[PDB]
Design a binder for this molecule. Sequence first.
Ligand SMILES: Cc1c(Cl)cc(N2CCN(C(=O)c3cc(=O)[nH]c(=O)[nH]3)CC2)cc1Cl
Ligand SMILES: Cc1c(Cl)cc(N2CCN(C(=O)c3cc(=O)[nH]c(=O)[nH]3)CC2)cc1Cl
Lengths: 306, 306
Amino acid sequence: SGFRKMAFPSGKVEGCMVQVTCGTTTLNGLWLDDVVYCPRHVICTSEDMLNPNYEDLLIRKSNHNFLVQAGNVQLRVIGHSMQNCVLKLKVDTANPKTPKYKFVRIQPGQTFSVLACYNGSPSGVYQCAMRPNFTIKGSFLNGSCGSVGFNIDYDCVSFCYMHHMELPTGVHAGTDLEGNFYGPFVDRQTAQAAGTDTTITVNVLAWLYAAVINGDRWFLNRFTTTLNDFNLVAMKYNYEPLTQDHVDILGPLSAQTGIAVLDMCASLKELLQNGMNGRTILGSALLEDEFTPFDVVRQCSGVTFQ
Amino acid sequence: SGFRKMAFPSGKVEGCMVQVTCGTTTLNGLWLDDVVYCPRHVICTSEDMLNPNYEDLLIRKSNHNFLVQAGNVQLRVIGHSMQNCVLKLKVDTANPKTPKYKFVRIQPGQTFSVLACYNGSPSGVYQCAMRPNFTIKGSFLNGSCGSVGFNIDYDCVSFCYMHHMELPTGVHAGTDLEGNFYGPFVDRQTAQAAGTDTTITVNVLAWLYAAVINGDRWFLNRFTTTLNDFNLVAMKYNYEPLTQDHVDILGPLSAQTGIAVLDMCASLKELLQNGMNGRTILGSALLEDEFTPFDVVRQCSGVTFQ
Ligand SMILES: Cc1c(Cl)cc(N2CCN(C(=O)c3cc(=O)[nH]c(=O)[nH]3)CC2)cc1Cl
Ligand SMILES: Cc1c(Cl)cc(N2CCN(C(=O)c3cc(=O)[nH]c(=O)[nH]3)CC2)cc1Cl
């Protein structure tokens, strides 16, 4: 029993983190095979932050302008290139700790683990969701750029996020590992704002199923509803509308508890219109939307990895 | 003078189009160096459309199950792999007509050219925009899957779109060339719906500047407005809000015409609240939002490519 904000074990990723220095700027890089990946704004100075021309800035660099350190061992840069917003540094030594990996782009509402790093050294791991406005509510300080987000599927690490910047509202923005930003953001130190966020409805429903599995039942009722009736209430409270695909995804949780999805939607409708009245669910006084249906199954039924 | 829906010259792309057959299914592929890229649902049959397991379907295939034709020359498949939603077929011959290229992921509101193809043969070219709901309003018939979208930057072809499917509403969905879908869609023949579309405001403003450059001035007025006052009216009419970044992008057009952006916004406010009253702008009775500021500059000031 129990329910926690659970991250993936980070060991396979810790061995890929390196320190990348260019000039007076130091941040984190990801070392897979003989390539080091890092944010391209490492080649920027204070004079170029507001409007950098990265093509010009890169042509004025040579391999010896890039210092790469894996712990205390230094890696020799033998080539460099730019792929969208990430810098690819070819080094003379292939990482012997390279795991089975792939580069994936995730969708809003999906979760992943973040290995926060400083000076190439892992500091902590935590779980977060990609928000519908393509930001993440992370925890990052100065020097954390190049930290990566990942999921583990069996023996394979799926890298999905590299950290680039913090927005004025305190939320965080980055790219996939091909260097393409999540959301309408650019790597320039200008004032950019995220659009309005919404609550991830399918995740809230999954979390309510986790509550029932763990013995929190006070919010259930006998009523039922339709998808269109529910979605009418949901839009009023800034909730993402619910699709038939979402209902299918929640199938294994409806079967394990014997509570139909549309039945659980009726409970959620009541919680939105009346609140929780000083009661808690799984130790929270708010509706939690950063657990996917898969996260719940993984924690309330059991999955490990090799 | 004049203003047209202008596409990029397609010659550099026509030489990369091939036909890919697997079983009874034939669609289009993109042949760059010694790799052929195509939608992975080419390995699906009618029995798997609703819920394909692509890992299983691919392990049951061998290289000789894939017939690749470049005109009449046949290409020998020596390897195959899956990267997200695209199939990568390694062939024995590198395309001698491979142009300088890169793979880019575009943002909503940006435009590109589509080379519609059938049986590996180019049929037509047209311009379209990525909608804010991550669909495109294309023109595609049966057999068009694998057609690609592209921009040309100097001598370099930037591939940004590969066509996968048509949604029930008649709009179209696809992936970038790394196989990651635009929008919340999956390559399964289930019922999926696009979210609500909005009008791309910065593009409408660019188009109004093109009108002024070409002698349509009847909608101008002496008034001005603020960003927050404009955005309040815009949201009422399902227009994307306007940012300071957008104002900067429109700079070259404001300078060429001597009409400040916030002045042009005041004209747009009036057109939204009063309509056009049987008058036309650049031969249209509706406000056009599929030309970017760069498209206008390119056509109203002059850019060619090598
Ligand atoms: C072009 C450009 C851009 Cl776009 C960003 C930076 N910065 C690099 C330094 N930096 C952090 O390390 C950091 C991350 C974080 O999440 N929170 C926090 O407080 N600090 C801020 C971003 C520099 C340049 Cl030249
Ligand atoms: C898993 C899967 C998926 Cl997701 C899609 C298809 N289709 C392949 C055939 N096809 C077209 O060629 C087509 C495109 C278009 O835009 N308009 C139109 O009328 N037809 C439809 C999609 C097949 C499979 Cl097995």
